[PDB]
Amino acid sequence: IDRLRRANLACEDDKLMIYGLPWMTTQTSALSINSKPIVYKDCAKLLRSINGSQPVSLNDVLRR
Amino acid sequence: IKAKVAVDNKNVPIPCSKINEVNNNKDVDTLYCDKDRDDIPGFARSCYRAYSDLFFTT
Amino acid sequence: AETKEFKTLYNLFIDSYLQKLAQHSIPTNVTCAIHIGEVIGQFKNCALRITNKCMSNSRLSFTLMVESFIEVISLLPEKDRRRIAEEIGIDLDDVPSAVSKLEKNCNAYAEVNNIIDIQKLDIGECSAPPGQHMLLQIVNTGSAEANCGLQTIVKSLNKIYVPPIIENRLPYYDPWFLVGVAIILVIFTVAICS
Amino acid sequence: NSLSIFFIVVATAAVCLLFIQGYSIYENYGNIKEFNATHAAFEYSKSIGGTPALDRRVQDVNDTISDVKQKWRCVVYPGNGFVSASIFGFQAEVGPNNTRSIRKFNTMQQCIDFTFSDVININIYNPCVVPNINNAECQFLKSVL
Amino acid sequence: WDPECSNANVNFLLTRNYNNLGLCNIVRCNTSVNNLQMDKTSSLRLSCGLSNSDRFSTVPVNRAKVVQHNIKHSFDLKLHLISLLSLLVIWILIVAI
Amino acid sequence: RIKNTVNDWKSLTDSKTKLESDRGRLLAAGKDDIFEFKCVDFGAYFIAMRLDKKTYLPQAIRRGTGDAWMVKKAAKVDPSAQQFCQYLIKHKSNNVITCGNEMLNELGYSGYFMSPHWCSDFSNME
Amino acid sequence: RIKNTVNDWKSLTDSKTKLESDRGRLLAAGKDDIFEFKCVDFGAYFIAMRLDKKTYLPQAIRRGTGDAWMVKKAAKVDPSAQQFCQYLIKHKSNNVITCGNEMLNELGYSGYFMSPHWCSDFSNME
Amino acid sequence: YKTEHCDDFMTGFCRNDPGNPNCLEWLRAKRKPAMSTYSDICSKHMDARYCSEFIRIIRPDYFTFGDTALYVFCNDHKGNRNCWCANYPKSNSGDKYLGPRVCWLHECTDESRDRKWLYYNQDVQRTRCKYVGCTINVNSLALKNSQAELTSNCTRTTSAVGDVHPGEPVVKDKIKLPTWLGAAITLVVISVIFYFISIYS
Amino acid sequence: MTDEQIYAFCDANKDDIRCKCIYPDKSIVRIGIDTRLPYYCWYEPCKRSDALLPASLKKNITKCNVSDCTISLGNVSITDSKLDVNNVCDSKRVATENIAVRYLNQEIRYPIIDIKWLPIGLLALAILILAF
Amino acid sequence: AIFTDASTVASAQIHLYYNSNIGKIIMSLNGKKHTFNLYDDNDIRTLLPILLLSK
């Protein structure tokens, strides 16, 4: 799980993306349970209501 | 007691699938576990488990 | 820690009612269920008991409930037992095998099925004497109207006042200040003597 | 003279601890003997390598073979029972002229017993090698592996 | 309940037998805990019906004797010896010295 | 050495063993062949497991004085490992090992708190 | 505290048994019918009990090596329970158990300090 | 993937990485090449998440492309504990719980169990069976120095419950020694040693 | 013994008390039917321990007066408490506040200091030479 | 917050079991176990939104 510690959710436009993954340089979308790329009209509002404006990595989530 | 690992001419450890042709051999190249080698992946863990499997009965 | 149950009026009533239900148990084809979404307990000696009875004959259920309630208040003072009786809606002079005001009030739950659904439940403070625990029960029965009677009688018995066990032990924090002061004053008296 | 007092008290502590330990051992030697006897396996665990215990005295061929095809299996020979097969060839028996002939087992259990028994009974019959070549047998062996 | 219908091939059953097979009542004991976080000092027990029949004894149990044995064979905090030694230490450190 | 190991593991192993005995006695209700050796595939190896009659605990064919006889597989589909496991069931079944108290008293570890292991919860819910 | 309390159990049992003996002596006056076996109904079960002629303590029909025989009732009025209690009175009456010290030396408890129990309920009712 | 122009390439492309979102969205078009490719994929890797998604996709229209796959898997991994509903371990009885009999084993008809491990006939017969039982289900149980006890004795039996068996008294009553006696010996021997040392010196 | 052997034996001896509810009189069966209570759930030879029963009789007696009551708890989290989910639906009464005491076969640890202290302790004695 | 589809999100309560010796995370959701391999890209892309949307 060490390589995933810098992964933070941050969505451009309405498509949920995952940043901070080093071995996958291209922007990798976020998949759902049925392995569908996540497109959400209110992604920014959801992220703000989850942690706030500032991005949160996986390391901060694990240290909660 | 000192443990050593069988390697080929390129200092790549011989897999277990060749054990039958290593026991019958007499001039096997061996690398001693005392000296650390960073080129072999997981050498420290392998030497650790080699030393640990000695002490089954004791 | 295996501790005894601290017997209390509503607990005695519930246990007597459950025993009477068990000794008149009859098979039935109705499905009776308990569904609790969340159970949260964070206080010590807060025992939780989820007993799932269900008797389809609700008339006999109220009969046994009133009988158990009468046997419970057989030890209370006369004025208190009587006033609690009118508060609940049960009259002692009436035979338990009769429809009372409480049953009439709780018949409004006849249409709904005999299922106990709690979205979220949390156990409050449970002050008990040492060696004993305060036990809370969630009892289901074969009719929601018998359940209505059950919780209303339980609340009425909870309305009484039982003196609480008070904790006199001070909160504990690691006391390095005392040993530090002791060392400092030992040095002080060493200097004074010298 | 504080140093002398400190030395005396620490040496007295050492001697007194020695005597206490001696008397406790004298009274509890039997007790610790049965405690160790009934808890002998608790001294050293058999997972010193971080892996489950393995008895090297009991030999298993599957520990070293990393190739499936090299392993010996029992396969259903169509219309002639069961045979023992591997990438090397079928397990055979001596023929009329000290040749190799595929030996055939009536039941899966008999084939398993013969193949995996401790007795060394390996007789390679390669149907794809030059001295003994059979197109149908070689095709079946290659297909069933 | 028929042993014949308990191992037959479902493809060769008539429609009526298929439905009758589908409309059986099956008893079901299971006391399942999907997720459990049990630490060193806690314990969990499960049962349905006779799933705990072997933990009950037909003969009566003298639980008083069980507690008496649990107290007899148990660690003894020697408060009498400790108090006597503490008193001796205090007397020696204050009066004797 | 023994006192420290016992303090660390004995009571936790006993509680876990009682829990799994209850679980397996619930599981054995209505099944008659659960007390017979079946070759269970654990991904990388096979193990000849049954359910112990007396304790209703998982039981496996043992390898000498070590742990269970884990027949390693050279791929996902290994007929040879399956057949050797069946051979063990028929022949080498006289020596068995049980999870929990017996494994702790024979090998020094219970197997319930080591992963991967055929007694552990993670390897059985995976 | 637990050790001290379990130690004091014996003295508490002696005192309660003796006091109950005094109250039994006081109660059994002018009533010869209380000295014979009667099927006392406890709301949920019948017990065939009396008072011992020597210790003046509640003495009931014993069930094997256990406590007093409790004829379970399936209803408020259960004729079968009463019939079976009478049957025990007339046939199986040679095996008896008495509250107090015999109860303590046989089953481990005194009968008193236990609620509900036939000794305590009979002392409270009578 | 609304037209079959990419079928030929994706057929070979998705065997390397069957979990690719593009491969699953190609499967979701529900054409024969996609379903057959994933049937061949899942006959060997039926214990992978993309095979759960494949089963969710095909059923109930094209269950025949999953069942076959399952069969192959459960005839190769007969030792898998998850193929023990479709392929019972008993040698003679492999079809023991096929069809409406799937509900005779309550482990097969469980909500926690994934439906990719049952044939479609077992899947449709899973919800229409009657269970006159008596069950306790707890989704989560976090114990912190607690003693939980989940008993359900439910069919009418003898009302009286026997006392729990206490085990056996393994510990033996050895002949002990007085508690103060070790302390007495220690003090006496220390005093005697000191007295002899003082006298001789 | 197998079911066929059971049938053959009980047909050989149809008056044996051991097999009396496997082949009961039609009177008993129709009394049970007309009471809405199957005979095998209450008829005494069925309850007998030594009575021999086939598979069908056993799997039908196992469903005698069985109730259908379920408890479905969610995320339970208790600390320093006791959880007692009874889900009891029969005449049997759960033994409330019945302290279940087992034999605590406690193993007494002894005050044995690790004997690695033996050299160091000797060193302690040695420092008396500093005071000479 | 768990996305049951591309555009649908639902609040859920999950349990996680991590085994770092083999590198796998088992997520109990709705009573069902989902095994995610930490060495798989798709499993990572599915699990990470679940972890990073926790509260």
Side-chain angles (χ1 to χ4, degrees), chain F residues 14-42:
Chain F
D14 197 352
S15 303
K16 190 60 152 49
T17 300
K18 291 192 290 232
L19 164 67
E20 321 284 343
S21 277
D22 275 293
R23 285 194 155 140
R25 186 177 296 113
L26 279 167
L27 173 72
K31 307 169 185 47
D32 296 355
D33 68 346
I34 200 157
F35 311 109
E36 293 179 353
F37 290 103
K38 279 169 308 303
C39 195
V40 187
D41 201 341
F42 277 91

Coordinates of all heavy atoms in Angstrom, one line a residue, chain F residues 14-42:
Chain F
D14 N -7.6 -20.2 23.2 CA -8.7 -21.0 23.8 C -10.0 -20.4 23.4 O -11.0 -21.1 23.0 CB -8.5 -21.1 25.3 CG -9.4 -22.2 25.9 OD1 -10.2 -22.8 25.1 OD2 -9.2 -22.5 27.1
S15 N -10.1 -19.0 23.5 CA -11.4 -18.4 23.2 C -11.7 -18.5 21.7 O -12.8 -18.9 21.3 CB -11.3 -16.9 23.5 OG -11.0 -16.7 24.9
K16 N -10.7 -18.4 20.8 CA -10.9 -18.5 19.4 C -11.3 -20.0 19.0 O -12.2 -20.2 18.2 CB -9.7 -18.1 18.6 CG -9.8 -18.0 17.1 CD -10.8 -17.0 16.7 CE -10.5 -16.4 15.4 NZ -10.2 -17.4 14.3
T17 N -10.7 -20.9 19.7 CA -11.0 -22.3 19.5 C -12.4 -22.7 19.9 O -13.1 -23.4 19.2 CB -10.0 -23.2 20.2 OG1 -8.7 -23.0 19.7 CG2 -10.3 -24.7 20.0
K18 N -12.9 -22.1 21.0 CA -14.3 -22.3 21.4 C -15.2 -21.7 20.4 O -16.2 -22.3 20.0 CB -14.5 -21.8 22.8 CG -13.8 -22.5 23.9 CD -14.3 -22.1 25.3 CE -13.8 -20.7 25.6 NZ -13.1 -20.6 26.9
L19 N -14.9 -20.5 19.9 CA -15.7 -19.9 18.9 C -15.8 -20.7 17.6 O -16.9 -20.9 17.1 CB -15.2 -18.5 18.6 CG -15.7 -17.8 17.3 CD1 -17.2 -17.5 17.5 CD2 -15.0 -16.6 17.0
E20 N -14.7 -21.2 17.1 CA -14.8 -22.0 15.9 C -15.3 -23.4 16.1 O -15.9 -24.0 15.2 CB -13.4 -22.1 15.3 CG -12.6 -20.9 15.3 CD -13.0 -19.8 14.3 OE1 -13.8 -20.2 13.4 OE2 -12.7 -18.6 14.5
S21 N -15.2 -23.9 17.4 CA -16.0 -25.2 17.6 C -17.5 -25.0 17.6 O -18.2 -25.8 17.0 CB -15.6 -25.7 19.0 OG -14.4 -26.5 19.0
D22 N -17.9 -23.8 18.1 CA -19.4 -23.5 18.0 C -19.8 -23.3 16.5 O -20.8 -23.8 16.1 CB -19.7 -22.3 18.8 CG -20.0 -22.6 20.3 OD1 -21.0 -23.2 20.6 OD2 -19.1 -22.2 21.1
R23 N -18.9 -22.6 15.8 CA -19.2 -22.4 14.4 C -19.3 -23.7 13.6 O -20.2 -23.9 12.8 CB -18.2 -21.4 13.8 CG -18.3 -20.0 14.1 CD -17.5 -19.1 13.2 NE -18.0 -17.7 13.2 CZ -17.2 -16.7 13.2 NH1 -15.9 -16.8 13.2 NH2 -17.8 -15.5 13.1
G24 N -18.3 -24.6 13.8 CA -18.3 -25.8 13.1 C -19.4 -26.8 13.5 O -19.8 -27.7 12.8
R25 N -19.8 -26.7 14.8 CA -20.9 -27.5 15.2 C -22.3 -27.0 14.7 O -23.2 -27.8 14.5 CB -20.9 -27.6 16.8 CG -21.9 -28.6 17.4 CD -21.8 -28.6 18.9 NE -20.5 -29.1 19.3 CZ -19.6 -28.4 19.9 NH1 -19.7 -27.2 20.2 NH2 -18.4 -29.0 20.2
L26 N -22.4 -25.7 14.5 CA -23.5 -25.2 13.7 C -23.4 -25.6 12.3 O -24.5 -26.0 11.7 CB -23.5 -23.7 13.8 CG -24.2 -23.0 15.1 CD1 -23.8 -21.6 15.1 CD2 -25.7 -23.2 15.1
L27 N -22.2 -25.6 11.7 CA -22.1 -25.9 10.3 C -22.4 -27.4 10.0 O -22.8 -27.8 8.9 CB -20.7 -25.6 9.8 CG -20.2 -26.0 8.4 CD1 -20.9 -25.1 7.4 CD2 -18.7 -25.9 8.3
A28 N -22.0 -28.3 11.0 CA -22.2 -29.7 10.7 C -23.6 -30.2 10.9 O -23.9 -31.4 10.6 CB -21.3 -30.5 11.7
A29 N -24.5 -29.4 11.2 CA -25.9 -29.8 11.4 C -26.6 -30.0 10.0 O -26.6 -29.1 9.2 CB -26.7 -28.7 12.2
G30 N -27.1 -31.2 9.8 CA -27.7 -31.6 8.6 C -26.8 -32.2 7.5 O -27.3 -32.6 6.5
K31 N -25.5 -32.3 7.8 CA -24.6 -32.8 6.9 C -23.9 -34.1 7.5 O -23.5 -34.1 8.7 CB -23.5 -31.8 6.5 CG -24.0 -30.5 6.1 CD -22.9 -29.4 6.0 CE -23.5 -28.1 5.6 NZ -24.7 -27.8 6.4
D32 N -23.9 -35.2 6.7 CA -23.3 -36.4 7.2 C -21.9 -36.7 6.7 O -21.2 -37.4 7.5 CB -24.2 -37.6 6.7 CG -25.6 -37.5 7.2 OD1 -25.9 -36.7 8.1 OD2 -26.4 -38.4 6.8
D33 N -21.5 -36.2 5.6 CA -20.1 -36.4 5.1 C -19.2 -35.3 5.4 O -18.1 -35.2 4.8 CB -20.2 -36.6 3.5 CG -20.6 -35.4 2.8 OD1 -21.1 -34.4 3.4 OD2 -20.4 -35.3 1.6
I34 N -19.5 -34.4 6.3 CA -18.6 -33.3 6.7 C -17.5 -33.9 7.6 O -16.5 -33.2 7.7 CB -19.4 -32.2 7.4 CG1 -18.6 -30.9 7.4 CG2 -19.7 -32.6 8.9 CD1 -19.5 -29.7 7.6
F35 N -17.6 -35.1 8.1 CA -16.6 -35.7 8.9 C -15.7 -36.7 8.1 O -15.1 -37.6 8.6 CB -17.2 -36.5 10.1 CG -18.1 -35.6 10.9 CD1 -19.5 -35.9 10.9 CD2 -17.7 -34.6 11.7 CE1 -20.4 -35.2 11.6 CE2 -18.6 -33.9 12.4 CZ -19.9 -34.1 12.4
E36 N -15.6 -36.4 6.8 CA -14.8 -37.2 5.9 C -13.8 -36.3 5.2 O -14.1 -35.2 4.9 CB -15.7 -38.0 4.8 CG -16.6 -39.0 5.4 CD -17.4 -39.7 4.3 OE1 -17.4 -39.3 3.2 OE2 -18.1 -40.7 4.7
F37 N -12.6 -36.9 4.9 CA -11.6 -36.1 4.3 C -12.0 -35.7 2.9 O -12.3 -36.6 2.0 CB -10.3 -36.8 4.2 CG -9.6 -37.0 5.6 CD1 -9.7 -38.2 6.3 CD2 -8.9 -35.9 6.1 CE1 -9.0 -38.3 7.5 CE2 -8.3 -36.0 7.4 CZ -8.4 -37.2 8.0
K38 N -12.0 -34.4 2.6 CA -12.2 -33.8 1.3 C -10.9 -33.0 0.9 O -10.4 -32.4 1.8 CB -13.4 -33.0 1.2 CG -14.7 -33.8 1.0 CD -15.9 -32.9 1.2 CE -15.9 -32.2 2.5 NZ -15.8 -33.1 3.6
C39 N -10.5 -33.0 -0.3 CA -9.4 -32.2 -0.7 C -9.8 -30.8 -1.0 O -10.4 -30.5 -2.1 CB -8.7 -32.9 -1.9 SG -7.0 -32.3 -2.2
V40 N -9.4 -29.9 -0.2 CA -9.8 -28.5 -0.3 C -8.7 -27.8 -1.0 O -7.5 -27.9 -0.6 CB -10.1 -27.9 1.1 CG1 -10.6 -26.5 0.9 CG2 -11.1 -28.7 1.8
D41 N -9.0 -27.0 -2.0 CA -8.1 -26.2 -2.8 C -7.9 -24.8 -2.1 O -8.9 -24.1 -1.9 CB -8.6 -26.0 -4.2 CG -7.5 -25.6 -5.2 OD1 -6.4 -25.1 -4.7 OD2 -7.7 -25.8 -6.4
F42 N -6.7 -24.5 -1.7 CA -6.4 -23.2 -1.1 C -5.7 -22.2 -1.9 O -4.9 -21.4 -1.5 CB -5.7 -23.5 0.2 CG -6.5 -23.8 1.4 CD1 -6.8 -25.1 1.7 CD2 -7.1 -22.8 2.2 CE1 -7.6 -25.5 2.7 CE2 -7.9 -23.2 3.3 CZ -8.2 -24.5 3.5

